[PDB]
């Protein structure tokens, strides 16, 4: 067995975009094991220690003007540049969700019908799933499994709705997503 | 509303190194440290953009030198093993005899070293399985995805066996047709 202690070091450069490239924040961070020790926040303008472990580094790096000026302009040469490079296939990537409605396999309490609205294979993750009973939105009884990121640039989610079904009622699952101009709807006819 | 992360790491004594780009949590690419080439997460990205993989190795060398300096500075304080949270799901609702994919989600763990194996009816699978590299997390722990394409049936049962230093015993997450 391998019992040797491990020593880990991570370096991350995060480009945060607001309203496209209008507002950009660059966050450079160093993490020893699970402890972030020093970082460079473009909103601050210089390296700052996050813990005592990183004090020597912030001080040393802030003494190098060439490093400091590159970091201060990186918001443009690094962040905005990379955004322009990947925008067409990342920011603008769109894959329509597959939507289907069927009753849950469980169905606990008798005179009740737990409905399931399955929404999968979509991108981006931003999505709106709502339930309606005869054209009026259902706030109560609605429960979601959450937004699941599949790791292959795809998302999925399950949004349930408990109902006291009455013949003739129409329960609609409506999905709004950037991939479509108008909402997608699937109806359960009770 | 959008975040692009260049994430790298070096780990001793495993001598493991990684360099990757992330977009809103999804990997754009990572560099193969041995072949010294860019590995795009999705085939098409390679036709829409490029990256000089060779140069990433310059960063990994600096990362290693920095790790050793920090290791000594901390008086050789080792990392605390944090066991993974493991979940198994299908990429889409399962339908009998309808092609699907089993996803083994390994999350919130560190250090970035894990052994994952798929088991179909108690026996190890290998056909068509794929996996991603370690993905970054805001808390600085890692995420990872392992995949297994399969054909649903009421007979075939599966298990995702995960080993990690933070786990006293191998963790097996079971899966089988129920719907």
């Amino acid at each position: 067995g391998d019992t040797r202690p491990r020593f880990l070091w991570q370096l991350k450069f995060e480009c945060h975009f607001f309203n496209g490239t209008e507002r950009v924040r660059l966050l450079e961070r160093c993490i020893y094991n699970q402890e972030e020790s020093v970082r460079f926040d473009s909103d601050v303008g210089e390296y700052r220690a996050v813990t005592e472990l990183g004090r020597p580094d912030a001080e040393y790096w802030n003494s190098q003007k060439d490093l400091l000026e590159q970091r201060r302009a990186a918001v443009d040469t690094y962040c905005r540049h990379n955004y322009g490079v990947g925008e067409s296939f990342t920011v603008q990537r769109r894959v329509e969700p597959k939507v289907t409605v069927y009753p849950s396999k469980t169905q606990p309490l008798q005179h009740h019908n737990l409905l399931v609205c399955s929404v999968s294979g979509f991108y981006p993750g931003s999505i709106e799933v709502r339930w309606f009973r005869n054209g009026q939105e259902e706030k109560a009884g609605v429960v979601s499994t959450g937004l699941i990121q599949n790791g292959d640039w795809t998302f999925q989610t399950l949004v349930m709705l408990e109902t006291v079904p009455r013949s003739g009622e129409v329960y609609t699952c409506q999905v709004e997503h950037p991939s479509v101009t108008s909402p997608l709807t699937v109806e359960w006819r009770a | 509303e959008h975040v692009i992360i260049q994430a790298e790491f070096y780990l001793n004594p495993d001598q493991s190194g990684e360099f990757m780009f992330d977009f809103d949590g999804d990997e754009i690419f990572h560099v193969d440290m041995a072949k010294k080439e860019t590995v795009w997460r999705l085939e098409e990205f390679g036709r829409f953009a490029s990256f000089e993989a060779q140069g990433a190795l310059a960063n990994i060398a600096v990362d290693k030198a920095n790790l050793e300096i920090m290791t000594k500075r901390s008086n050789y304080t080792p990392i605390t093993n944090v066991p993974p949270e493991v979940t198994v799901l299908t990429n889409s609702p399962v339908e009998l005899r309808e092609p699907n994919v089993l996803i083994c989600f390994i999350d919130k763990f560190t250090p970035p070293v894990v052994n994952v194996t798929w088991l179909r009816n108690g026996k190890p699978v290998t056909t068509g399985v794929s996996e991603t590299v370690f993905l970054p997390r805001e808390d600085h722990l890692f995420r990872k995805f392992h995949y297994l394409p399969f054909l649903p049936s009421t007979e075939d049962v599966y298990d995702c066996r995960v080993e990690h230093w933070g786990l006293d015993e191998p963790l097996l997450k079971h899966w089988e047709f129920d719907a």
Partner: peptide
């Protein structure tokens, strides 16, 4: 894409 160079400690 372009990378940010790693700063040496």
């Amino acid at each position: 894409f372009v990378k940010q160079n790693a700063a040496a400690l």
